Design a protein around this ligand. Structure first.
Ligand SMILES: CCCCCCSC[C@H](NC(=O)CC[C@H]([NH3+])C(=O)O)C(=O)NCC(=O)O
Ligand SMILES: CCCCCCSC[C@H](NC(=O)CC[C@H]([NH3+])C(=O)O)C(=O)NCC(=O)O
Lengths: 208, 208
């Protein structure tokens, strides 16, 4: 199958999908649409938003997929990255929920002029961000393995590292000297997944 | 097992859990904490946030669960409300993702000075809200059955109707004469689920 992931030139909502396929060892075309080209591409995209995933089989079937974490969950499930048990499934989802909460704190700072971007950054870093990071640390501590849930890679591992990257975007040193579970998680995840480690080495700094 | 759902006196994040259990025919204790009582209750809750679900079996085991849609997804999966195939699973998740987007637009109106609140409402109802409602309508249109995904109730059905209630909280007539798929969905859902229809009739009015 040809898998084409369509997004803007950034991590954003597409990163969960990219990382899932990378971790699973699945090849895909990573298509990045410039903001200038978006107006003409927009009508060709079912639903008119990105991420969109276009899957073509070798018998001409074209499957369109939207909603990033729905796609990632689908792909993760196909490749046994959503839990081995109902209990592991819950814990995978618990961490995705906690990480998405954090992602939505980070979203408040976006599309805002420098001025109030900084006021909002200070607000969330003094409030909900540390609250959510501790909660994430508690989830990680409760794992029976090296990773988020057990010893094998799940979607929770991937969702977590992408949102931490957004947190460090707001403040490079926010986790420095703190949240030992989150640091230890990223190192165990990179150790367990040479594919992901190489992927992360090869991208390709983006502002979002 | 005894299931106690702990939340504030409101729909909010607990409603997905309540509806899941109600739809599945699972009995639970619905515990509502006053805002005044919260400071003494808070330290007794693992992670110090609501909703939290405390489960006690007949052999003294206490299982604590946090993160509402992780909990809902867990219960939904136990009771075959997350799709019967990988494709249905994707579609369930696609609708949850779209409905949660809408919910987060609604969240921007909260904890805001009373007008303030009104300018945000006007921003989102002229912006992202109709965008997402249409996207949700396209998802509903693509179902093979009378409900969100097929013919039997899934978590997507329940997540959708809760978020629509938040939209009508902002503006009661926003879907009047519009979004035929959403109205038809609620109608088919209550017909398919007398338990849920009963539950929504007996539910006391709540501001959030
Ligand atoms: C770090 C940045 C992340 C902010 C989220 C925006 S992704 C860009 C946007 N798409 C969405 O908001 C889709 C959100 C959806 N919940 C998903 O994850 O797929 C879009 O196509 N917008 C262009 C358009 O609407 O025309
Ligand atoms: C309709 C708006 C309500 C939706 C968000 C508020 S739920 C109340 C809040 N908890 C959360 O934000 C949990 C969010 C988490 N993502 C979940 O879904 O469980 C809390 O316990 N806060 C009390 C505290 O932190 O002390």
């Amino acid at each position: 199958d040809h898998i084409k992931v369509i997004y803007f030139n950034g991590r954003g909502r597409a990163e969960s999908i990219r990382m899932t396929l990378v971790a699973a060892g699945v090849n895909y075309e990573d298509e990045r649409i410039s903001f200038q080209d978006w107006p003409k591409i927009k009508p060709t995209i079912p639903g008119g938003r990105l991420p969109a995933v276009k899957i073509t089989d070798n018998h001409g079937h074209v499957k369109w997929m939207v909603e990033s974490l729905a796609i990632a969950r689908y792909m993760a499930k196909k490749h046994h990255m959503m839990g081995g048990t109902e209990e592991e499934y819950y814990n995978v989802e618990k961490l995705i929920g906690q990480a998405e909460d954090l992602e939505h704190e980070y979203y408040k700072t976006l599309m805002k002029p420098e001025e109030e971007k900084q006021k909002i950054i200070k607000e969330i870093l003094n409030g909900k961000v540390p609250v959510l990071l501790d909660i994430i640390c508690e989830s990680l501590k409760a794992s029976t393995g090296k990773l988020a849930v057990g010893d094998k890679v799940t979607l929770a591992d991937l969702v977590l590292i992408a949102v931490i990257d957004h947190v460090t975007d707001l403040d490079k040193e926010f986790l420095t000297g703190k949240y030992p579970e989150i640091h230890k998680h990223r190192e165990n995840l990179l150790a367990s997944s040479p594919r992901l480690a190489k992927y992360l080495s090869d991208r390709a700094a983006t502002p979002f």
